[PDB]
Design a protein around this motif. Structure first.
Motif, PDB file in Angstrom:
ATOM      1  N   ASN A 266       2.730   5.060   4.652  1.00 32.61           N
ATOM      2  CA  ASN A 266       2.615   4.894   6.105  1.00 32.61           C
ATOM      3  C   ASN A 266       2.747   3.453   6.522  1.00 32.61           C
ATOM      4  OD1 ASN A 266       0.355   7.463   5.786  1.00 32.61           O
ATOM      5  ND2 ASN A 266       2.170   7.681   7.025  1.00 32.61           N
ATOM      6  N   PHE A 267       3.292   3.233   7.725  1.00 34.51           N
ATOM      7  CA  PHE A 267       3.353   1.853   8.294  1.00 34.51           C
ATOM      8  C   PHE A 267       3.276   2.006   9.798  1.00 34.51           C
ATOM      9  CE2 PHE A 267       7.632   1.417  10.060  1.00 34.51           C
ATOM     10  CZ  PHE A 267       8.337   2.427   9.431  1.00 34.51           C
ATOM     11  N   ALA A 268       3.061   0.840  10.417  1.00 36.72           N
ATOM     12  CA  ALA A 268       2.912   0.720  11.855  1.00 36.72           C
ATOM     13  C   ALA A 268       3.828  -0.396  12.373  1.00 36.72           C
ATOM     14  CB  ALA A 268       1.506   0.382  12.201  1.00 36.72           C
TER      15      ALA A 268
ATOM     16  N   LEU B 291       1.077   7.739  12.599  1.00 34.14           N
ATOM     17  CA  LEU B 291       1.795   6.599  12.028  1.00 34.14           C
ATOM     18  C   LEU B 291       3.257   6.932  11.711  1.00 34.14           C
ATOM     19  CD1 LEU B 291      -1.162   5.369   9.894  1.00 34.14           C
ATOM     20  CD2 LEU B 291       0.099   3.913  11.483  1.00 34.14           C
ATOM     21  N   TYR B 292       3.996   5.867  11.442  1.00 38.98           N
ATOM     22  CA  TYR B 292       5.311   6.083  10.799  1.00 38.98           C
ATOM     23  C   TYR B 292       5.077   6.436   9.342  1.00 38.98           C
ATOM     24  CZ  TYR B 292       7.481   2.981  14.422  1.00 38.98           C
ATOM     25  OH  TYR B 292       7.894   2.305  15.613  1.00 38.98           O
ATOM     26  N   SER B 293       6.109   7.023   8.706  1.00 39.66           N
ATOM     27  CA  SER B 293       6.196   7.034   7.266  1.00 39.66           C
ATOM     28  C   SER B 293       7.567   6.576   6.831  1.00 39.66           C
ATOM     29  CB  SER B 293       5.824   8.310   6.597  1.00 39.66           C
ATOM     30  OG  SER B 293       6.762   9.343   6.969  1.00 39.66           O
TER      31      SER B 293
ATOM     32  N   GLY C 124      -9.940  -1.888   5.007  1.00 37.84           N
ATOM     33  CA  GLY C 124      -8.950  -0.886   4.611  1.00 37.84           C
ATOM     34  C   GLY C 124      -7.753  -1.529   3.998  1.00 37.84           C
ATOM     35  N   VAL C 125      -7.101  -0.615   3.215  1.00 39.53           N
ATOM     36  CA  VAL C 125      -5.909  -0.972   2.504  1.00 39.53           C
ATOM     37  C   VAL C 125      -4.875   0.131   2.721  1.00 39.53           C
ATOM     38  CG1 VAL C 125      -7.101  -2.401   0.828  1.00 39.53           C
ATOM     39  CG2 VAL C 125      -6.696  -0.017   0.312  1.00 39.53           C
ATOM     40  N   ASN C 126      -3.651  -0.155   2.307  1.00 42.90           N
ATOM     41  CA  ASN C 126      -2.418   0.617   2.663  1.00 42.90           C
ATOM     42  C   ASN C 126      -1.515   0.543   1.417  1.00 42.90           C
ATOM     43  OD1 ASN C 126       0.076  -0.296   5.242  1.00 42.90           O
ATOM     44  ND2 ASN C 126      -0.207   1.699   4.321  1.00 42.90           N
ATOM     45  N   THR C 127      -1.560   1.615   0.533  1.00 39.95           N
ATOM     46  CA  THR C 127      -0.716   1.545  -0.692  1.00 39.95           C
ATOM     47  C   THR C 127       0.182   2.806  -0.751  1.00 39.95           C
ATOM     48  OG1 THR C 127      -2.437   2.404  -2.095  1.00 39.95           O
ATOM     49  CG2 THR C 127      -2.183  -0.039  -1.962  1.00 39.95           C
ATOM     50  N   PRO C 128       1.297   2.694  -1.594  1.00 37.21           N
ATOM     51  CA  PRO C 128       2.202   3.811  -1.645  1.00 37.21           C
ATOM     52  C   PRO C 128       1.772   4.973  -2.483  1.00 37.21           C
ATOM     53  CG  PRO C 128       3.314   1.924  -2.411  1.00 37.21           C
ATOM     54  CD  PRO C 128       1.863   1.510  -2.201  1.00 37.21           C
ATOM     55  N   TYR C 129       2.406   6.083  -2.358  1.00 37.36           N
ATOM     56  CA  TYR C 129       2.158   7.270  -3.127  1.00 37.36           C
ATOM     57  C   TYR C 129       3.435   7.860  -3.702  1.00 37.36           C
ATOM     58  CZ  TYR C 129      -2.391   7.246  -0.863  1.00 37.36           C
ATOM     59  OH  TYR C 129      -3.638   6.871  -0.338  1.00 37.36           O
TER      60      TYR C 129
ATOM     61  N   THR D 161       0.826  -4.591   6.129  1.00 36.07           N
ATOM     62  CA  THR D 161      -0.132  -3.538   6.182  1.00 36.07           C
ATOM     63  C   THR D 161      -0.437  -3.122   7.644  1.00 36.07           C
ATOM     64  OG1 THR D 161      -2.122  -4.881   6.345  1.00 36.07           O
ATOM     65  CG2 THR D 161      -1.299  -4.524   4.088  1.00 36.07           C
ATOM     66  N   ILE D 162      -0.875  -1.871   7.743  1.00 34.92           N
ATOM     67  CA  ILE D 162      -1.266  -1.345   9.056  1.00 34.92           C
ATOM     68  C   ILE D 162      -2.465  -2.107   9.621  1.00 34.92           C
ATOM     69  CG2 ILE D 162      -2.198   0.585  10.409  1.00 34.92           C
ATOM     70  CD1 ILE D 162      -0.872   2.231   8.003  1.00 34.92           C
ATOM     71  N   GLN D 163      -3.370  -2.540   8.705  1.00 35.64           N
ATOM     72  CA  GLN D 163      -4.528  -3.340   9.176  1.00 35.64           C
ATOM     73  C   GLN D 163      -4.072  -4.649   9.713  1.00 35.64           C
ATOM     74  OE1 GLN D 163      -4.300  -1.846   6.028  1.00 35.64           O
ATOM     75  NE2 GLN D 163      -5.696  -0.178   6.412  1.00 35.64           N
ATOM     76  N   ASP D 164      -3.059  -5.306   9.094  1.00 36.85           N
ATOM     77  CA  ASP D 164      -2.586  -6.522   9.616  1.00 36.85           C
ATOM     78  C   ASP D 164      -1.872  -6.310  10.968  1.00 36.85           C
ATOM     79  OD1 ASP D 164      -3.827  -8.230   7.778  1.00 36.85           O
ATOM     80  OD2 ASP D 164      -2.061  -8.321   6.563  1.00 36.85           O
ATOM     81  N   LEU D 165      -1.109  -5.196  11.088  1.00 37.97           N
ATOM     82  CA  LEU D 165      -0.459  -4.907  12.403  1.00 37.97           C
ATOM     83  C   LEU D 165      -1.531  -4.758  13.496  1.00 37.97           C
ATOM     84  CD1 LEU D 165       0.391  -2.463  14.483  1.00 37.97           C
ATOM     85  CD2 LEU D 165       2.038  -4.309  14.012  1.00 37.97           C
TER      86      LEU D 165
END
Ligand SMILES: O=C(O)CNC(=O)C(=O)O
Ligand SMILES: [Mg+2]
Ligand code: NI
Ligand SMILES: [Zn+2]
Length: 331
Positions: free
Chosen positions: A284-286, A188-190, A164-169, A149-153
């Motif tokens: 999105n990712f980081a 961010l990246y996608s 916050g959380v980071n899920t797909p669409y 997750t981006i929060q973990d990065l």
């Protein structure tokens, strides 16, 4: 300097190289892939996202969006009119109807010509931005619902712990459905996987030249520019390749087919369109290299861009000077 012309690169990782996602992103960057703003990744032949798609028609598109254009064929905006809910099976049938189906065409280039000539005269319906995933839980490699997750990065790089959380669409497309020129939230990246159906054509501006696109957009959409100093965050403006070439804007194009991944890189402006009925998944990712882009990302504060819950912390930690104004635009 690798890839100094900023060409879109295509990668063919082996099954071994497909194990470690972060490592492979860093590899692509070592070869200069990010300079383009976009890369294609063709999975190894041994990999699959899931066993079959035979069972997806029951997914609900709660708010299908009719994309209504205004302007001229090469320079237009689109607004999203909400439509009544429908299932994926219902939306597929609608995509394949005479009113909405892909016209006869010779090849991707002919279809691209027809898109830019005729897009504005139609209002295709897009099932965008549906929280969910079509990866099988047993798919271990490049499963977009199992990424770091981006929060973990941010926590790993900076030490700070945030909500916050980071899920797909999911995105269900049809002929002429359109994604407007944008970078990602917080630059961010996608990553985007085309699960099934017809292709998606992409346009991209190298990150090093993004401000050239911004300056053209201010010229071409002058009232929008006065309204907001980051109006491309609204994700409504389209500019054709012909208009970009007339104005000297560096860009590239590529067509993604089913079974292929695309990665967009920080501050890589992109836009594009679907060829016919399809389904994509994106998130999105980081990486560590993103952090400096996140710190410098523009922001819409006019109220139009309205985004996820999780962007609050990114602004608050990376852009504390901007936080108060941006949060007013959220509220
Ligand atoms: O597929 C789409 O409609 C839009 N996707 C993206 O902008 C992306 O993956 O970053
Ligand atoms: Mg179903
Ligand atoms: Ni995007
Ligand atoms: Zn705005």
């Amino acid at each position: 300097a690798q890839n100094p012309n900023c060409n879109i690169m295509i990668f063919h990782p082996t099954k071994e190289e497909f194990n470690d996602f972060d490592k492979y992103i860093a590899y692509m960057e070592s070869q200069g892939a990010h300079r383009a703003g976009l890369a294609k990744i063709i999975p190894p032949k041994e990999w699959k996202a899931r066993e079959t798609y035979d069972n997806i028609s029951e997914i609900l598109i709660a708010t299908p969006l009719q994309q209504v254009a205004s302007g001229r064929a090469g320079v237009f905006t689109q607004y999203h009119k909400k439509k009544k809910a429908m299932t994926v099976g219902e939306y597929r049938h609608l995509a394949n109807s005479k009113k909405y189906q892909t016209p006869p065409h010779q090849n991707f280039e002919d279809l691209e010509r027809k898109y830019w000539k005729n897009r504005i005269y139609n209002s295709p319906i897009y099932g965008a931005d549906i929280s969910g995933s079509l990866f099988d839980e047993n798919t271990k490699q490049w499963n977009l619902g199992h990424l770091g997750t981006i929060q973990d990065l941010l926590e790993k790089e900076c030490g700070v712990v945030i909500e916050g959380v980071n899920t797909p669409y999911l995105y269900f497309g049809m002929w002429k459905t359109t994604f407007a020129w944008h970078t990602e939230d917080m630059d961010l990246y996608s990553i985007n996987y085309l699960h099934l159906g017809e292709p998606k054509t992409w346009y991209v501006v190298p990150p090093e030249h993004g401000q050239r696109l911004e300056r053209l957009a201010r010229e071409l959409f002058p009232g929008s520019s006065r309204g907001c100093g980051a109006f491309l965050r609204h994700k409504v403006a389209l500019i054709s390749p012909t208009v970009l070439k007339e104005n000297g804007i560096p860009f590239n194009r590529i067509t993604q087919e089913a079974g292929e991944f695309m990665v967009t890189f920080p501050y890589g402006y992109h836009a594009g369109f679907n060829h016919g009925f399809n389904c994509a998944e994106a998130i999105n990712f980081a990486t560590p290299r993103w952090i400096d882009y996140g710190k410098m990302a523009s922001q819409c504060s006019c109220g139009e861009a309205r985004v996820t819950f999780s962007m609050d912390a990114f602004v608050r930690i990376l852009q504390p000077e901007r936080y108060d104004l941006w949060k007013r635009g959220q509220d």
